[PDB]
């Protein structure tokens, strides 16, 4: 019935737009780390310890809207 | 700082020739002035050259 249709699409735009701000996010932080690894080396380890730090706060929000997709699809539809 | 790029004359290097700038008199009646140098240039050349580390003047 019209049930399934609309929730898997639903789903879909969640883990979509998802994709796009865990994506990026990480490839704006990520690409700041990796000048720093090149510009200092011998501080990889430390900076790595910062880069750890900040990339869970960037994954917190798209991880709840990949937890809430993962539940649509398997658990609502 | 470990801030430091690439750059020959701030960065070592291992050694096989070294060159001295000597400066020295245009005239004399200086009395042991030059010599005195030039002997401890001398013992300082003869040490590298003891090596075999050429030198340049």
Same mark, same amino acid.
């Not at chain 1, 490839?27 to 790595?48: C, M, N, S, Y």
């Not at chain 2, 750059?7 to 290097?13: A, Q």
């Given at each position: 019935?019209?049930? *399934?249709?609309?929730?898997?699409?639903?789903?879909? /735009?969640? *883990?979509?737009?998802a994709a796009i701000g865990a994506a990026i996010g990480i490839g704006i932080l990520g690409g700041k780390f990796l000048e720093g690894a090149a510009r200092?080396?011998?501080? $990889?380890?430390?900076l790595?310890?910062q880069f750890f730090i900040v990339m869970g706060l960037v994954d917190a929000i798209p991880? $709840?809207? /990949?937890?809430?997709?993962?539940?649509?699809?398997?658990? /609502?539809? | %700082?470990?801030?430091?790029?690439?750059?020959?004359?701030?960065?070592?290097?291992?050694?096989?020739?070294?060159?001295?700038?000597?400066?020295?008199?245009?005239? %004399?009646?200086?009395? %042991?002035?030059?010599?005195?140098?030039?002997?401890?240039?001398?013992?300082?050349?003869?040490?590298?050259?003891?090596?075999?580390?050429?030198?340049?003047?």
């Amino acid at each position: 019935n019209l049930n *399934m249709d609309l929730l898997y699409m639903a789903a879909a /735009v969640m *883990m979509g737009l998802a994709a796009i701000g865990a994506a990026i996010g990480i490839g704006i932080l990520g690409g700041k780390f990796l000048e720093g690894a090149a510009r200092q080396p011998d501080l $990889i380890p430390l900076l790595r310890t910062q880069f750890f730090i900040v990339m869970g706060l960037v994954d917190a929000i798209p991880m $709840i809207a /990949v937890g809430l997709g993962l539940y649509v699809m398997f658990a /609502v539809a | %700082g470990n801030l430091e790029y690439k750059h020959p004359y701030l960065e070592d290097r291992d050694v096989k020739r070294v060159g001295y700038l000597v400066v020295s008199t245009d005239r %004399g009646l200086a009395g %042991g002035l030059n010599i005195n140098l030039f002997k401890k240039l001398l013992a300082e050349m003869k040490t590298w050259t003891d090596k075999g580390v050429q030198a340049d003047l």
